[PDB]
């Protein structure tokens, strides 16, 4: 735990989010679910900025107190949150990360429940099944880091495993079951 071997072993990061995982049938591979509670807190800063562009609050700290504690989160607030992300995309990460796709980019969208909704196709990617596991979620604050995040880290852009020219968006069990019982 010295100085040279410090910048390597990395450490803890901000805007971090994680929780029990579940499949997201309706969800498109182009996106990824995400608990409203999380996204909201995991976006306090950004949110506040947009809160200003709207008569929600007079100034920064104004909006901070607006929701400093509210069991009645204004309906306007929510609509704004979504209005904050828009294009911006976050990142997903399985605990045991060994391959690059151990982390893929997704376009979050308001969802119910307290667990994170994840697309079934990437289940194969991040070695994980829906028995109770839990992924991680980061957010490219840097409008520059946001680029490469959806340009070269977006899921829909990573299909051909670098390990082998074998497809990654390979349909699994259920999908197959049907596609076969029909043909």
């Amino acid at each position: 735990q010295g100085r040279f071997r410090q910048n390597l072993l990395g450490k803890r990061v901000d805007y971090s989010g994680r929780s029990v995982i579940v499949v997201g049938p309706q969800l498109k591979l182009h996106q990824c679910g995400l608990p409203k509670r999380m996204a909201l807190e995991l976006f306090k800063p950004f949110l506040l900025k947009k809160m200003e562009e709207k008569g929600i609050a007079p100034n920064v700290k104004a909006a901070r107190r607006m929701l400093e504690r509210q069991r009645d989160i204004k309906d306007e607030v929510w609509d704004a949150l979504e209005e904050v992300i828009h294009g911006k995309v976050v990142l997903l990460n399985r605990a045991p990360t060994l391959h690059r796709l151990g982390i893929q980019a997704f376009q979050p969208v308001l969802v119910e429940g307290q667990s994170i909704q994840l697309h079934p196709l990437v289940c194969e990617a991040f070695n994980a099944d829906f028995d109770g596991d839990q992924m991680a979620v980061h957010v490219p604050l840097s409008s520059f880091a946001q680029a490469e995040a959806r340009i070269q880290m977006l899921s829909a852009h990573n299909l051909l495993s670098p390990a082998s020219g074998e497809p990654l968006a390979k349909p699994s069990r259920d999908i197959i079951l049907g596609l076969y019982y029909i043909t």
Binding site: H86, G87, F144, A147, E148, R150, Q152, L154
Partner: protein, 93 residues
């Protein structure tokens, strides 16, 4: 996936090139004011309940859409270094 992402990769000589290009123009769009676009007339990005996504949606979302059209030009040494923020800040409020 993302809008004509393929058409993009085909315009660049390297995957990573695109990224750096999308990011640089993305900033110039917000810092130097949000009126540097070139496709503002029609087919301009829109929102939902209120198509107010005609002014300030998302940086990159616009950047790429700009490259969608061969209106812009890029390269290694196109325009002088410093002569960058000088000709931009004076041309745009």
């Amino acid at each position: 996936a993302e809008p004509g992402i393929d058409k993009l990769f085909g315009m660049v000589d390297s995957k990573y090139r695109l990224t750096v290009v999308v990011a640089k123009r993305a900033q110039q769009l917000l810092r130097h004011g949000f009126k540097n676009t070139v496709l503002e007339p029609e087919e301009r990005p829109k929102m939902q309940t209120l198509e107010g996504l005609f002014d300030d949606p998302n940086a990159v979302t616009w950047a790429m859409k700009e490259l969608l059209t061969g209106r812009l030009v890029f390269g290694e040494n196109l325009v002088p270094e410093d002569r960058l923020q000088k000709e931009m800040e004076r041309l745009y409020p």
